[PDB]
């Protein structure tokens, strides 16, 4: 068994779990932490190399899954029960489970216990709190306003959402950026800036420095920031995010996941290392003692880690939050919502006109299918993949390929509408090829804007 | 094969190596020495022209490498063994070998054999030596005090360094300008001026004239100065620099390097001209007979050149010295350290306060990434590059571009954190564009101070 985990993770602790797995199977478990493994993995996976199992944030596993680089796992209903139900959503791609949830990460309210022993429960309290802290040379709250990741929890509190998640599946046409809930949260954000309780230019560096110096009573940040606060000697706590209109703040949730290589011949061995060795209290502890995982998916060991109220706050916020969509369409969400917040916060646009523009940007006419890519290639063949969002509406994909700039009649085949990968063979080495995919409806037409890419073998 | 070498180099000797390469391959080798070729090369390289191979000092190859203008070479472990291990560091950029080391250059102690048949082994000897030479109408030592390049060997002797070089990689946050070793060497320098053994206003011209006239017993200078001394008729020797606190003086090392064009289709031919034709004893001799290379990287021929003790002193000092960093951050080092030495030497600042100010100047909050630049452009497209120092910390770069002064929503794409170049296409001809690069952490924020540039197509 070959395992890839990041260098910042408890890789020596994982090696102790491997030693125990070896101690009663005779199966050698080797743990590697290559540089840039998240870039490395797809380069080696389809082309017959790579590890049996990969550990990474779930926001990358989506790209791996579209290319079919990850085995569909099949854990028991009883094993699933051992883990928090929402974690299973993070590792679901195309209705299939493609990874095991390991750890959970989300933003929390970080407060200065000296300045503010009892931090506010609602966003509505903060203005008045700020005004009283000003009269004492301080501010209530500073955090990264430039990034939708940090500001989305407040915007989502009511209606706000990225893409509706209905039953194991995203509805990429249903976007909740424009709804009255999203307007209410952003309006409140903008009003904080308007009423001089916050500053529109405040970024990550300015927020962190202020809090760690003791200039501001609160910040909004993730577990990664704790180590720098520990060193600052600030008497800090970590707690649930404030409510807005009675509703919990909804941060994006990131899940450290253990996926199994599709090409691996050790799939059953990997199943058992993970299920019956790593995802136990003794498995996760050995890794946690090496380097802390934060909040974990395994209920049993999470109940123990929560003795640390910072880890408990991370879990509470995560459970009130929204799993981070790992679909390619998130990139349109980030760009449009980034612009909207900045434009509303700067006073360049009204909240209404900023989020409207973002909604129409997300839902704008696009490529169908989307994110077509070469995943691996010999000099005579290509492996290609594309996004499967519309598979229910798609009867079949029609794929064409031909030498770029040339005038030969294209070569053509079709693939069923459930499919999202394809092989192209019989090509010429060192030649540019234009690959186009058309998505056909059940009604004899293809959906607007087929997608093409160029690539040289 | 087309080769670019400077006009001051043995270009006719290199043409004889080309004749021999032609004599058993039928491959024509043409050697050109254009004016300002170091400026010329990047202008022509990315835009499809330029030579197959370029010869230049390694301090320029860093800029060529950031833009990806140089092919990664892949010599054998056995071929690498033929050359001095430290030379390979000079031609390493982003962990990759991007050139072949040819010749080596460093400062040495130049002494007058008439005045001083046995030159001092330690810096500590010089004061007493100066006082005895004064009583005879002479001084011990004169050299270029205005430039950190000339004064750094003494400052580095103990702890002093620019950027820690750990394993094929610089740590640009680890700067050794402030450490006690750097304070000790500079203090000793300042004390020489204080005790009237040297003068703070002494520059290159004043040092050279004094030594060549026979007014001073020693100078500190490089091989380039020897020709003028030969003519002065001074009975001079060239030797190892003095120690300081038992430690060797550590001069910056410059390496004449042979790089291969990334755009070249003759990469394997160039590999073999260089490896099996130029970098041999017969190859380097033919060039050396035309015009002397000084100390060379090829162990085998260097052992022969060292029969000349001046060439041997250059090599000995080089091996005790520090490879010249060819990263863009060196420019901050030069400016800050130049000021520090001058300020301490003039008595405007204490040594401690001068080097502290320089340390905080080098490590000061900056652009991330740094040195963003256009490397080549058609009227509809730009090729851009930036510094890759933080690639391990960077998850991805977010690049934006839009018409300057305009108010259109920016166009945006992202590139992986390993990358350091990008293509921007679909632009308008004769229009100003603002290009910004943001470096994202793995924690959903960008590092402080993204970098932007303007450029008209």
UniProtKB/Swiss-Prot annotation, chains A, B:
Record's subcellular location: Periplasm
Keyword Membrane: no
One of the GO biological process terms: cell chemotaxis
Annotated keywords: Periplasm, Signal, Sugar transport, Transport
Induction: Induced by maltose and the transcriptional regulator MalT. Permanently repressed by cold shock in a PNPase-dependent fashion.
Gene3D superfamilies linked: Periplasmic binding protein-like II
GO cellular component: ATP-binding cassette (ABC) transporter complex; ATP-binding cassette (ABC) transporter complex, substrate-binding subunit-containing; maltose transport complex; membrane; outer membrane-bounded periplasmic space; periplasmic space
GO MF annotation list: carbohydrate transmembrane transporter activity; maltose binding
Statement: the UniProt record of this protein carries the keyword Magnesium: no
Oligomeric and partner information: The complex is composed of two ATP-binding proteins (MalK), two transmembrane proteins (MalG and MalF) and a solute-binding protein (MalE).
Job description of the protein: Part of the ABC transporter complex MalEFGK involved in maltose/maltodextrin import. Binds maltose and higher maltodextrins such as maltotriose.
Family that this chain belongs to: Belongs to the bacterial solute-binding protein 1 family.
NCBIfam families named among the record's database cross-references: PRK09474.1
Protein name as annotated: Maltose/maltodextrin-binding periplasmic protein
High-level lineage: Bacteria, Pseudomonadati, Pseudomonadota, Gammaproteobacteria, Enterobacterales
């Amino acid at each position: 068994l070959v395992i890839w985990i990041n260098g910042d993770k408890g890789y020596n602790g994982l090696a102790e779990v491997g030693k125990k797995f070896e101690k009663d199977t005779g199966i050698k478990v080797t743990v590697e932490h290559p540089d840039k493994l998240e870039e490395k993995f797809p380069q080696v996976a389809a082309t017959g190399d790579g590890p049996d199992i990969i550990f990474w944030a779930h926001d990358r596993f989506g790209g791996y899954a579209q290319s079919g680089l990850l085995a569909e796992i099949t854990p028991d209903k009883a094993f699933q029960d051992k883990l928090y139900p929402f974690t299973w959503d993070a590792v679901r791609y195309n209705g299939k489970l493609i990874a095991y949830p390991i750890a959970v990460e989300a933003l929390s309210l970080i407060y200065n216990k000296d300045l503010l022993p009892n931090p506010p429960k609602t966003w509505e309290e903060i203005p008045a709190l700020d005004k009283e802290l000003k009269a004492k040379g301080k501010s209530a709250l500073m955090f990264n306003l430039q990034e939708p990741y940090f500001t989305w929890p407040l915007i989502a509190a009511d209606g706000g959402y990225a893409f509706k998640y209905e039953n194991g599946k995203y509805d990429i046409k249903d976007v909740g950026v424009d709804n009255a809930g999203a307007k209410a949260g952003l309006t409140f954000l903008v009003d904080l800036i308007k009423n001089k309780h916050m500053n529109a230019d405040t970024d990550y560096s300015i927020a962190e420095a202020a809090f760690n110096k003791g200039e501001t009573a609160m910040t909004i940040n993730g577990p990664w920031a704790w180590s720098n606060i520990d060193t600052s000697k600030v008497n800090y706590g970590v707690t649930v995010l404030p409510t807005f209109k009675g509703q919990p703040s909804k941060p994006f949730v990131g899940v450290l996941s253990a996926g199994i290589n599709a090409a691996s011949p050790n799939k059953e061995l990997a199943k058992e290392f993970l299920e019956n060795y790593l995802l136990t209290d003794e498995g996760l502890e050995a890794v946690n003692k090496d380097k802390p995982l934060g909040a974990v998916a395994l209920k049993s060991y999470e109940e123990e880690l929560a003795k640390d109220p910072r880890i408990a706050a991370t879990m509470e916020n995560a459970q009130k939050g929204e799993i981070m969509p790992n679909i390619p369409q998130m990139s349109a969400f980030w760009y449009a919502v980034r612009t909207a917040v900045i434009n509303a916060a700067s006073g360049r646009q009204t909240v209404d006109e900023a989020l409207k523009d973002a909604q129409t940007r997300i839902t704008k006419g696009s490529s169908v299918p989307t994110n077509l890519e070469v995943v691996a290639a010999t000099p005579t063949s290509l492996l290609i993949s594309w996004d499967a969002s519309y598979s229910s509406s798609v009867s079949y994909y029609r794929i064409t390929y031909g030498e770029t700039g040339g005038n030969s009649p294209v070569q053509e085949f079709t693939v069923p509408g459930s499919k999202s990968t394809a092989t192209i063979s019989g090509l010429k080495p060192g030649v540019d090829y234009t690959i186009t995919v058309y998505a056909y409806s059940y009604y004899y037409y293809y959906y607007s804007s087929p997608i093409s890419i160029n690539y040289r073998t």
